[PDB]
Amino acid sequence: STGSATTTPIDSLDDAYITPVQIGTPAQTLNLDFDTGSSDLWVFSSETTASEVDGQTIYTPSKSTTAKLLSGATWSISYGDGSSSSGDVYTDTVSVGGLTVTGQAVESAKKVSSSFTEDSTIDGLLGLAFSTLNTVSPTQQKTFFDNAKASLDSPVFTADLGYHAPGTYNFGFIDTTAYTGSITYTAVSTKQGFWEWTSTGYAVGSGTFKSTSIDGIADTGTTLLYLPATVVSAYWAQVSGAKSSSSVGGYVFPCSATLPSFTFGVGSARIVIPGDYIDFGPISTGSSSCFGGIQSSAGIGINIFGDVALKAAFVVFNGATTPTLGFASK
């Protein structure tokens, strides 16, 4: 089997991407944030505290003939941005882009934090990291991909995120028309439960490539590119007037600037992020200070290849017995 679904930016900045997901019988379609940095599939629901729902579409398990309470199971998760959610668990039929999993753990939110409430466009998350990170207790549950894997034509999924435009998540096949050149594959460590890999270096603009190992994660659920302070300083030093602002919470730059590109290494291959992808717009409406898309990972404790980086590439998440990651230009 295979599946193919379009993923769409939630706003004009590509802050996140949402993908329609069918849950239950008859289908209830929710728009979920596919997140390769976590491993829970959770949804706004009929059980979510009413004051914490503001415009989201909810899953109502009592209206699904295939929903079953997973008795005694609870979940609770916190994300890198400090947001969180928790609740109980149902199993139900879940389909993405024509690919169907029966008995998928669907984690129903009883509580969500303010940033989730405030984001009316995101009806929940679909985790695509390794199932060892799943938070369900006392019986850990498998991700949608893990459940689908044995049925897929090939044990892979791909992320093809657009810049200010829709893109595609495919399951079970590699669309050879979706990228240029060849795909370069690189080793993955699953020791921390992430799609963790080591970039071979970077360049700023038309500058020379610096060979240096950068361990980080491929994370579709993180908006920005978080790299070591040395690398980030070298980038922003090429933008007149750019500075790190503690009050804003990172690097900002004059909105009048033209940003240089940023290149990252994948083995001997190179992925180029155009300068425009690094512009996240005014810090507040009407400001001439703009937020940067490359930020320091210092104090996160991990480097994160988020959407800013991933949307510059066609990315293969290879879930074979020994997982790997592939990157191609597009």
**What's the rounded Cα separation, in Å, for the pair 305 and 197?**
10
Q: Which residues of 261-279 are buried (b: 16+ CB within 10 A; e: fewer)?
A: bbbbbbeebbbebebebbb
**What's the rounded Cα separation, in Å, for the pair 32 and 41?**
9
Same domain? 36 vs 183: no
Q: Is the dihedral of CA 62, 63, 69, 75 positive or negative?
A: negative
For every residue of the chain, which 3-state class applies, written as one string? CCEEEEEEECCCCCCCEEEEEEECCCCEEEEEEEECCCCCEEECECCCCHHHCCCCCCECHHHCCCCEEEEEEEEEEECCCCCEEEEEEEEEEEEECCEEEEEEEEEEEEEECHHHHHCCCCCEEEECCCHHHCCCECCCCCCHHHHHHHHCCCCEEEEECCCCCCEEEEECCCCCCCCCCCCEEEECECCCCCCEEEEEEEEECCCCCEEEEEEEEECCCCCCEEECHHHHHHHHCCCCCCEEECCCCEEEEECCCCCCCEEEEECCEEEEECHHHHEEEECCCCCCEEEECEEECCCCCCEEECHHHHCCCEEEEECCCCCEEEEECC
For residue 100, the domain's CATH number is: 2.40.70.10
**What's the rounded Cα separation, in Å, for the pair 239 and 218?**
26
Distance of CA 209 to the CA centre of its chain: 27
The answer to whether 231 and 246 have CB atoms below 8 angstroms apart is no
Same domain? 261 vs 240: yes
Residues 6+ apart with CB under 8 A from 201: 209, 210, 211, 212, 213, 214, 264, 265
**What's the rounded Cα separation, in Å, for the pair 293 and 239?**
13
Is residue 254 reached through a cis peptide bond, with omega within 30 degrees of 0 on the bond before it? no
CA distances from 65 to 16, 25, 29, 87, 130 (A): 32, 6, 15, 21, 29
Nearest to 125 by CA among 21, 183, 47, 43: 43
Same domain? 27 vs 116: yes
The answer to whether 70 and 90 have CB atoms below 8 angstroms apart is yes
**What's the rounded Cα separation, in Å, for the pair 105 and 93?**
9
In this structure, are strands 3-9 and 68-78 parallel, antiparallel, or unpaired? unpaired
Same domain? 146 vs 43: yes
Same domain? 162 vs 202: no
The answer to whether 58 and 23 have CB atoms below 8 angstroms apart is no
Contacts made by residues 238-242, CB under 8 angstroms, sequence distance 24+: 238/204, 238/205, 238/207, 242/292
- Looking at the 3D structure of the chain, how many domains does it have? 2
Same domain? 189 vs 263: yes
State the chain's maximal CA–CA distance in angstroms: 60
Residues 6+ apart with CB under 8 A from 53: 44, 117
Same domain? 144 vs 201: no
**What's the rounded Cα separation, in Å, for the pair 46 and 226?**
36
The residues pairing with 19 across neighbouring beta strands, listed in sequence order, are 32
**What's the rounded Cα separation, in Å, for the pair 105 and 218?**
24
Nearest to 293 by CA among 316, 261, 315, 325: 261
Same domain? 258 vs 328: yes
Pair of tokens at residue 253 = 């730059």
Supply the residues annotated as catalytic. Answer: 35, 199
Same domain? 181 vs 250: yes
Nearest to 223 by CA among 4, 9, 54: 9
Domain containing 288 equals 175-330
Residue 211 φ/ψ region, left for φ over 0, alpha for ψ in the -120 to 50 degree band, beta for the rest: beta
**What's the rounded Cα separation, in Å, for the pair 162 and 142?**
28
Q: Which of 174, 197, 219 is the last residue of a domain?
A: 174
Amino acid 39 reads S
The answer to whether 149 and 155 have CB atoms below 8 angstroms apart is yes
For every residue of 35-99, which 3-state class applies, written as one string? ECCCCCEEECECCCCHHHCCCCCCECHHHCCCCEEEEEEEEEEECCCCCEEEEEEEEEEEEECCE
Phi/psi of residue 141, each to 5°? Answer: -110, 160
Q: Which of 158, 174, 190 is the last residue of a domain?
A: 174
Q: Which of 174, 190, 206 is the last residue of a domain?
A: 174
Phi/psi of residue 52, each to 5°? Answer: -105, 5
Nearest to 38 by CA among 133, 110, 142, 107: 133
CA distances from 43 to 2, 50, 112 (A): 23, 14, 10
In this structure, are strands 225-227 and 294-296 parallel, antiparallel, or unpaired? parallel
Same domain? 166 vs 303: no
**What's the rounded Cα separation, in Å, for the pair 76 and 80?**
14
The answer to whether 12 and 99 have CB atoms below 8 angstroms apart is no
Pair of tokens at residue 15 = 């802050």
The answer to whether 111 and 86 have CB atoms below 8 angstroms apart is yes
The answer to whether 259 and 241 have CB atoms below 8 angstroms apart is no
Experimental method: X-ray
Same domain? 49 vs 154: yes
Amino acid 181 reads G
Same domain? 75 vs 216: no
The residues pairing with 254 across neighbouring beta strands, listed in sequence order, are 289
Residues 6+ apart with CB under 8 A from 142: 105, 131, 134
